[PDB]
């Protein structure tokens with residue numbers, strides 16, 4: 477089954493008011509939610525209301541959905557509740573800077589898909605679950621975890637007083653759930669590589685057309701990747717601290733593989749930390765920089781994500797040259 481929020485939890489969220497100083501900061505792509513843990517459910521409510529209006533959801537149902545989503549994220553080093561809210565905030569900023577390019581239905585579906593995209597993550601990759609024939613790999617052949625995250629999202633909506641979409645007409649309901657399903661599967665990085673090459677060719681040739689549903693799905697797919705990886709778009713100390721959380725989870729998986737008699741890939745090996753600055757360089761060159769370059773060409777208002785990603789690539793290159801200061 478699914479874990480449920482207490483009455484105190486969602487009632488506490490209903491009376492949450494955001495500090496006026498934060499209303500300005502939240503609009504910016506570089507916004508770091510890190511220092512405001514007590515306000516994270518409240519920041520999501522504010523985002524929903526700012527993106528889709530104050531009445532888009534029955535306030536009571538929205539607060540219950542949010543606090544139960546929080547309760548079904550695990551205490552893992554990276555794929556946790558903090559990650560969900562960070563990903564949802566990047567989607568908010570993208571949607572605010574390109575608001576009428578997207579319909580009300582898409583905005584509702586995308587913000588909720590971002591909050592739910594890693595629901596019940598156990599801190600183990602698709603490679604681990606496949607390699608060690610976990611039941612999840614038998615149920616879901618490809619994009620194993622992502623198909624499980626969506627399955628988890630539908631289950632929360634299926635709880636009493638949690639279906640925030642039950643008031644949509646029969647047709648827009650099916651439409652929103654499909655927007656959500658496609659958004660969550662798109663967060664499987666395996667699919668990103670093909671998605672970005674298909675989008676780049678459509679852009680360079682001028683065939684890219686947002687009124688074409690297949691094109692719309694791919695653009696939303698790239699937006700999902702862009703949000704999922706947005707830790708590489710923050711101010712350098714935030715980017716570096718999240719990288720510590722990301723590697724703490726990879727090293728725990730690698731530790732599990734060594735217990736099983738299998739040498740992990742160097743990236744998951746805590747005895748190979750000297751290889752991290754070069755691995756980040758490879759990740760930015762092959763994954764991050766291309767993602768934001770393509771997203772920027774399609775949606776010019778997202779240029780700050782690209783700019784910030786280029787600045788963080790410079791910082792990683794400074795680490796390799798032994799020019800870094802600070803720490804902590």
Ligand SMILES: COc1cc2nnc3n[nH]c(C)c3c2cc1OC
Nearest residue numbers: 665704705707708719722755756759
């Ligand atoms: C900050 O560097 C990284 C960020 C990441 N974020 N999400 C990820 N999902 N799956 C993978 C493999 C991710 C990943 C990898 C990174 O370096 C290798």
Ligand SMILES: [Mg+2]
Nearest residue numbers: 593594663664
């Ligand atoms: Mg994921």
Ligand SMILES: [Zn+2]
Nearest residue numbers: 593594663704
């Ligand atoms: Zn994620």
